[PDB]
Amino acid sequence: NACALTHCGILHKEEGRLVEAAESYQKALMADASYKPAAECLAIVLTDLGTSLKLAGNTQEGIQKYYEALKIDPHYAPAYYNLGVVYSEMMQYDNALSCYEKAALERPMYAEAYCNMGVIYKNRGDLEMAITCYERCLAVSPNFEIAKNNMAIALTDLGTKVKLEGDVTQGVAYYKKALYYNWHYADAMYNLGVAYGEMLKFDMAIVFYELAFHFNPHCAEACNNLGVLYKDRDNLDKAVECYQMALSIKPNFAQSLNNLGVVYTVQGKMDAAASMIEKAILANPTYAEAFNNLGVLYRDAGNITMAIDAYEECLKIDPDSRNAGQNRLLAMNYINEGLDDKLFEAHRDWGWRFTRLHPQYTSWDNLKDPERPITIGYISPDFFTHSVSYFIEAPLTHHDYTKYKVVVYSAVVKADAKTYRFRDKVLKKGGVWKDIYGIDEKKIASMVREDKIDILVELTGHTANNKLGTMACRPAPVQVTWIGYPNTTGLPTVDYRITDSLADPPDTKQKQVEELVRLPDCFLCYTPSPEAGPVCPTPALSNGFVTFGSFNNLAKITPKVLQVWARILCAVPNSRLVVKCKPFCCDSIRQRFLTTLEQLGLESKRVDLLPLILFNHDHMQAYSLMDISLDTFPYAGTTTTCESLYMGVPCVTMAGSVHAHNVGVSLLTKVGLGHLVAKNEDEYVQLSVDLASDVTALSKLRMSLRDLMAGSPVCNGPSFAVGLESAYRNMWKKYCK
Amino acid sequence: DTLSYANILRARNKFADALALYEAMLEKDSKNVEAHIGKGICLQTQNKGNLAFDCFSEAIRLDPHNACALTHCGILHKEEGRLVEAAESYQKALMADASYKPAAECLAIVLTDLGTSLKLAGNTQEGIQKYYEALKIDPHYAPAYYNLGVVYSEMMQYDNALSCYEKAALERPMYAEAYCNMGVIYKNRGDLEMAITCYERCLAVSPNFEIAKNNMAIALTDLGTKVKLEGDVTQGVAYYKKALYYNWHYADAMYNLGVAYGEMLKFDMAIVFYELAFHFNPHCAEACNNLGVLYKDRDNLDKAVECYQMALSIKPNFAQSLNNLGVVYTVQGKMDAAASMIEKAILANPTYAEAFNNLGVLYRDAGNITMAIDAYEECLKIDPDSRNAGQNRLLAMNYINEGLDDKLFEAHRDWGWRFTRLHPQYTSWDNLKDPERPITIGYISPDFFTHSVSYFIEAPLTHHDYTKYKVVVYSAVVKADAKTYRFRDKVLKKGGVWKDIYGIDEKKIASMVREDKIDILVELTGHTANNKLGTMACRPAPVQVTWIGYPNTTGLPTVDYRITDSLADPPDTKQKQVEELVRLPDCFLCYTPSPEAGPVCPTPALSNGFVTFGSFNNLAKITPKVLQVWARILCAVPNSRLVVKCKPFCCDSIRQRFLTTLEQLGLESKRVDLLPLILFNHDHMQAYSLMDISLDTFPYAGTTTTCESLYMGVPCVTMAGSVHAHNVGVSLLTKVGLGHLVAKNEDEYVQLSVDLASDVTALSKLRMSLRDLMAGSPVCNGPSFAVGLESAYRNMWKKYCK
């Protein structure tokens, strides 16, 4: 009785007696081989046995039982599925794929076969077809979770692949589809975020990153990116918070280490910045930007030599690093006195390389008429409350706008009342302001060409955010540099340079690539600020001793200056020095500086280190706290000396062999105080002691300084303007020939 | 020189040395008030509160007059929490010196603190006056103005609040809280522009002040909703995203983005944003509702049910979710649960018209025709232009309207007039009025799949002289299948011009049909579901014909002719219709047998020893009036068994109701086998082995069911009546040659049924020979039917040309 045997086999299977069920089905099929139900039940029992053996570790017995089942019933899709699974466990990926294909040909509702084939194929990287397999799976069953998750993963991988080839839009589309299949997928959100960041969306980049972090609190990359976006929005506190979270998750994420170091540098917390950057170097030796940031941190912190060394390693890692090279040259300007031709050669080599990777123009449509109206463009990122602004203000106001059309290219990152006032003055005379912050160098060159300027004046040189890349294009028929840098730009593309006969004597030995154009009178036209207040009386009259001071930065105070100041203060009993500068907000810097002076035998008590109290009026009045300003070398001050003079504190400087050194000589002699210019360190000491010995002469000098200078040419805007215009006309006439 | 040197030394961050000098001065200079003051200040700055208090007390004892000493005493009192004492010292100092500034500002501070204390005590007027006194001693003190603004705001003096916060903002521009509160007040007045501006100022001062960010996000979301309501959806989305910038987890902004993208048809993004909105605000039931709608429209019914169950778990009386869940259950066939859902939706909201429409359709499927009709009339009371409600209402009335008056015709006429007054039409055609050139025949219908209409339209589709009547098919089929594709091949292999028109519009379709130069437009659908009567409302074709899609008048004056025969619609029929009836010589239907019908088998009664009646008609046709007649039949015939097969029986509720009805009518359920809808065509066809005699329904006769019965050799008993739908069976049976099986009344019907039941043997023989008899009859005479239909086309076209 085939029916009774089949029912017995089914009952045995229901009781878990798979062997007895198989035996009963075999007997039934021996009695009637056409009894389809008996064959089906036997195949079922054989598949159950095979699955038990597979899970029991009897892989070979499982395979054998599956082959027997598939020989008994070909149409039994589950046997094909189990065979494919076993072959996958056997790493027979092609055999597994074939088994799943057969199973899908047999079972029309076996979506798991599509899922597993898609997974296996994904493991070999043929993403698109596997995705098609998942599409078939979800077309059969649209709620199968595991398949949705694999669909999202595969779509994210494909979107990343396609984006890396440059089709950002298709990558974004794949990420959005992935989020359609799995909304809480951190990788999709993160990738989408970076994609938006690339296409300058910012807003949604931030939103996406925050969501990605919310759904996966282990994506330090998301935190770091978010911190970067907030930093670029000037929300420094949020940026710090984000980076701190990133480091709390990954205490070695080198990129976040550098970024946090930079933000601390902006806030001026120098010791923490140093520690973070050093940790970044410890974590990454190839991360050039870490070396550049370390070099800037050393530069402002005064450890100059170490700054040059750090930039040198940076250029060993990335020889094209623009920032590393320019900061290196700027730092060298602080200590390389005129002796050798190493700074000059460095400038020449750097300019030649910059010209090699940056081609320039070769023709100009400027009508070569020596007498027609000349268009002068002044370019600078420093038309804000910055040292340079204290001088360029003079030409902005005292210039003829009838034949010298002035156009200003202000790259100021943050305007202010002074920015607005400057634009107002320039435009009121007929100027065409042009805000260029963020604009690509090449586009700036094109814009300059379109406006058809004649004399292009670069005002920053190798300082932060410089625009020498625009100058390399040679957009204007004549390019000059003036105030932003006291040495050669090194660019052969600049035609001439403006100077005076005192900063650069006709016999100067400092080699430079540029031809010096010496103005008749002084080349510095300091515009006194109206917030200077009254000339405070000589402190010596009320205190009873001379107080030296120096309102310069740390980069300019080379150890040699420290030796000279220690000699001065030891040689003059009862005399105090009150240096003031921004980095003295850090206690560690104060301690190190005090110890450094102590090794020179000077009692720290006499010194009065002060931070950069951000108070314009109070900054001006602070010269009421000192009696004699002592200039630094080999990088003498320019605005600082002007401030000293205008507040009645006499400044003593030293002459030297390079423009950067002799700027103070030029200024002091041209203000008619050349008798306070020492020629050497010994004469410097003698002058300092002599000035310190006569408090009454000091009082007379202070009370005379404001009116003498106000009547002196340094403040005679009209005459300086006439000289400058004549110089411009002369260079233009030379060019016409 | 000593006092000057001490003061300079104290100013030069040399507090220890200055303190030592002050000590040696109070020692040497026993009554040196200035030295006592210097010592007090240097110790206070050294956090020597006790010593500072001692020095200040000694200074006051020596000089009770100098304003500086009293100022230092007052500040120390404030640091010690002696607000009162500080205040008295301050008044004394003011009386001593009115020019001192530090005392003035610190005095403003202490009095504003006092005013705040009194305000907290409820002494609002005393606080206000104290603040005014402070501002009189120092107008520049912004915090006093801020306090005034707060008190006036809580005091509902909003204009005064603005004035106060503006005086504060002038006196202190970096006072973020003033901007925040100003923005909040403007938010309260409905104006969101200036409010956003105030929040922008606040964030321009302090971007980390989160409270202003949240309030800004709220304001931007409201602004986005407003702008969207104005029409500009892109700007709305822009505002929503800018909002979601300030509060990345603001769930409501995500929900509104979901809505905005849904309107844009970017459904995938809509899903993402609705799911996120729900994730951040579980209480946002509306997000679940709309998510369920989107998933339902993607045919993912299980997820739609899940989403609606969540919406109802949040708001059980959320009418929209109740209605949509009811519809989803309707598609799945959970008829009783659907009924309960829709009824609860109505109970929660009585004006939700579409719920009334869905209730009416559900009851019509359940056979309660009266209640379905009633629900449709209620719907039309709530919404009178509900096109679907009207369509279902007329269709439902066709199931129980026994021809006894002209009210149905009146309703159809008025409804068609409504359509003609809410639709325009053309008046000229360039089609050459010629009776010899090949005419263009359009068949338009959504039923070109496994539907009743197909089983009849297939025959002409197979037999159309293509050299004369160029066939154009306008298919509104929604879901195709193997049969649909097979039909496509059949139409496209004989030179037909197929045109898929599903899912676009009515007006544009009519215009395209006119471009197609269709000569006669034929509707095959009637007032059923997915009809396209709106196209004909435009009158796109010069000739309009309705073949079977509707068994009664369409009521549209725009339809010229309705195809019928002289038996279903006798020439003397009294039912008026707007259309002209065209009677074909033979039965107006040509049944195309299924190529899967298979063979016939031995009569069941022969093997079981008892006669089995049956009805495969849907429950909608089995009105409560036929049930009594059927009970009479089964009682009159000893040992008979009734098999009824209708879809809605899958639900136990309807089954039980039907059984109860039969039991109260005098019949034991044990004789009644109720079978639900079977799965595949084959088994449905084979189910005819379960019945011996088909019993036709009235006043709506079967059409496909009757044809199938005659095919498979199961005789059907029908009766003639006053309406076409009743006489369809009469026409069919007469034209097959079984006119002796046509009853004229209920009693003749009973007698005929008994007569057929009395002779099992002859019944079996007839059953055997019926397939060949009918196959030889005109109902299967494709050539003759085609020729007659061609003649009909020629006659109508010639009539039109003249």
Curated annotation (Swiss-Prot), chain B:
Record note on what altering K621M does: In spy-19; Abolishes O-fucosyltransferase activity
Tissue: Widely expressed. Present throughout the plant (at protein level).
Sequence segments annotated as region (Catalytic region): 387-802
Pathway annotation: Protein modification; protein glycosylation
Pfam family, one: TPR_1
Domain notes: The TPR repeats mediate protein-protein interactions and are essential for its function. Expression of such repeats in plants accelerate flowering.
GO annotations of cellular component type: cytoplasm; nucleus
Record InterPro entries: Glycosyltr_41/O-GlcNAc_trsf, OGT/SEC/SPY_C, Sel1-like, TPR-like_helical_dom_sf, TPR_rpt
Phylogenetic placement of the source organism: Eukaryota, Viridiplantae, Streptophyta, Embryophyta, Tracheophyta
Protein name: Probable UDP-N-acetylglucosamine--peptide N-acetylglucosaminyltransferase SPINDLY
Catalytic activity of the protein: L-seryl-[protein] + UDP-N-acetyl-alpha-D-glucosamine = 3-O-(N-acetyl-beta-D-glucosaminyl)-L-seryl-[protein] + UDP + H(+); L-threonyl-[protein] + UDP-N-acetyl-alpha-D-glucosamine = 3-O-(N-acetyl-beta-D-glucosaminyl)-L-threonyl-[protein] + UDP + H(+); L-seryl-[protein] + GDP-beta-L-fucose = 3-O-(alpha-L-fucosyl)-L-seryl-[protein] + GDP + H(+); L-threonyl-[protein] + GDP-beta-L-fucose = 3-O-(alpha-L-fucosyl)-L-threonyl-[protein] + GDP + H(+)
Phenotype upon changing G549S: In spy-3; induces a constitutive induction of GA signal. Abolishes O-fucosyltransferase activity
GO BP annotation list: cell differentiation; cytokinin-activated signaling pathway; flower development; gibberellic acid mediated signaling pathway; negative regulation of gibberellic acid mediated signaling pathway; protein O-linked fucosylation; regulation of reactive oxygen species metabolic process; rhythmic process
Keywords: Biological rhythms, Cytoplasm, Developmental protein, Differentiation, Flowering, Gibberellin signaling pathway, Glycosyltransferase, Nucleus, Phosphoprotein, Repeat, TPR repeat, Transferase
Effect of inactivating the gene: Altered root epidermis morphology and root hair patterning.
Keyword Magnesium in annotation: no
Top EC class, one word: transferase
Stated family: Belongs to the glycosyltransferase 41 family. O-GlcNAc transferase subfamily.
EC number from the UniProt entry: 2.4.1.255, 2.4.1.221
Subunit structure: Homomultimer; via its TPR repeats. Interacts with GI. Interacts with TCP14 and TCP15. Interacts (via N-terminus) with APRR5. Interacts with CPN20.
Function: Probable O-linked N-acetylglucosamine transferase (OGT) involved in various processes such as gibberellin (GA) signaling pathway and circadian clock. OGTs catalyze the addition of nucleotide-activated sugars directly onto the polypeptide through O-glycosidic linkage with the hydroxyl of serine or threonine. Probably acts by adding O-linked sugars to yet unknown proteins. Acts as a repressor of GA signaling pathway to inhibit hypocotyl elongation. Functions with GIGANTEA (GI) in pathways controlling flowering, circadian cotyledon movements and hypocotyl elongation.
Highest taxon listed in the record's lineage: Eukaryota
Predominant place of localization: cytoplasm
